[PDB]
Amino acid sequence: EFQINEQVLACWSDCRFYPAKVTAVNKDGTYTVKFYDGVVQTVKHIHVKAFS
Amino acid sequence: EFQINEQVLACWSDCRFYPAKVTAVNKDGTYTVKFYDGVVQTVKHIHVKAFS
Structure with a gap:
């Protein structure tokens, strides 16, 4: 698994x-990530x- | 533009x-589409x- 603040x-x-920063690792196996432009998205590992 | 009921x-x-059926054409230039499994998504043209 990728960790917080990792791209x-x-x-x-x-x-x-596109490159996105991991801002949260969720116990359900998803990450919240943020693209360079500040757009946030929840995604499966x-x-x-x-x-x- | 694609029309309603078009894939x-x-x-x-x-x-x-993946193939999705157009279920609505929106004036803002997006479509609502539905994948074979019934998952609905709004997407830009x-x-x-x-x-x-």
């Missing part, structure tokens, strides 16, 4: 991945990738 | 496209593709 690739509405 | 490809949380 990941998260999927946006255009079906592309399986739907984010490592950002390197 | 399109719409993006889901796994960053893949620019974020769906033709399904053929």
